[PDB]
Amino acid sequence: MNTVPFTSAPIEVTIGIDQYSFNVKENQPFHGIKDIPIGHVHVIHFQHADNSSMRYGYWFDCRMGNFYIQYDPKDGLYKMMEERDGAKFENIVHNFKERQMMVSYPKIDEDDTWYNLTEFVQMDKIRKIVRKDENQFSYVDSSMTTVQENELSDPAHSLNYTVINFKSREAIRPGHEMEDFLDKSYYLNTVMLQGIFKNSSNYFGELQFAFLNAMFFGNYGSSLQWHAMIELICSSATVPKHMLDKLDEILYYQIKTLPEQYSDILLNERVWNICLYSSFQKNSLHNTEKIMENKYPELL
């Protein structure tokens, strides 16, 4: 398996790895996380105990290199870095375990939750949305704005999500104003799926990444992007059958994983009432509707 070691834990912090989180005290003996699956995509995230402002973290893929965490006392945050000397890294991680100052990832392999939430998320697409070419891992935080938000103030520190805007020339063909506004199928199928994303898997990947950035970091522009990408599908009369069925599964696991105490801040009442009850695809989201009704009846 792979390991993410820490040099130390100088400040008290809540650390998340994928959907799991634990606390570390100030100057606790802690040297990282062990026994995590290689294989795909992960996220390690942080929220400082003495200042819950700025949640931040790093998306990474074990397979792309050896990654570790070191606290930087000048910038005041835990930073991810890459070790290019694999022998040194094996030398550490084969010992720090030997110490047992690391926490294990649990996998009760009945749980497939992480894979259901990240099925379509790929590190190389993350790196296109979060542009920092010199690192193999990608930093996101609670405050980062989207390129689209910026169009309404540092383009380097931004989330380059695909711009979705229902009242824009991209979404509306001249001469089809009412048609394209009331049935977004043109914008979904010709512009987004055939023009920009190439296939539905890449579309779902950005939707899943957006959701996870909203949930893990409380990133508002990510939440906007998640809801937009859902509403575009639901507001289209014409949507491949596979994509609809897959959307229901994707959304079901996202609603299932959402903290119950977080529904006022992560769920947009307007969008969900449209999708589940007033949209072309209402009756195609059977499992999502069932968990929403029983889990969050107040919103609806």
Partner 1 sequence: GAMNSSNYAELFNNDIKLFVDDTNVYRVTVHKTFEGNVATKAINGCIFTLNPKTGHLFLKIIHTSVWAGQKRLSQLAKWKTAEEVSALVRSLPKEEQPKQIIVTRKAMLDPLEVHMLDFPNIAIRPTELRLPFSAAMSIDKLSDVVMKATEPQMVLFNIYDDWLDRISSYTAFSRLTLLLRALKTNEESAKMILLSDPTITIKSYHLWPSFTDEQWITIESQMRDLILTEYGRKYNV
List contacts with partner 1 (CB under 8 A): 167-169, 172, 174, 177-178, 181
Asked if 200 contacts 246 with a C-beta cutoff of 8 angstroms, the reply is yes
In this structure, what are the phi and psi dihedrals at residue 206, rounded to the nearest 5 degrees? -65, -40
Q: How many CA atoms lie within 13 A of 97 on its CB side?
A: 15
User: What is the phi-psi region of residue 18: left when phi exceeds 0, alpha when psi lies from -120 to 50, beta otherwise?
Assistant: left
> How far is it, in rounded angstroms, from Cα 219 to Cα 55?
9
Least Å from the CB of residue 267 to partner 1: 24
> How far is it, in rounded angstroms, from Cα 216 to Cα 262?
11
Least Å from the CB of residue 231 to partner 1: 15
Least Å from the CB of residue 166 to partner 1: 9
> How far is it, in rounded angstroms, from Cα 33 to Cα 102?
5
The position carrying tokens 């999708």 is 275
> How far is it, in rounded angstroms, from Cα 66 to Cα 59?
13
- Pick 74 or 167: Cβ nearer partner 1: 167
Least Å from the CB of residue 165 to partner 1: 10
Least Å from the CB of residue 182 to partner 1: 8
Pair of tokens at residue 69:
């965490």
Which of 224, 227, 243 is CA-nearest to residue 185? 243
Least Å from the CB of residue 237 to partner 1: 15
CB atoms under 10 Å from CB of 91, counted, come to: 11
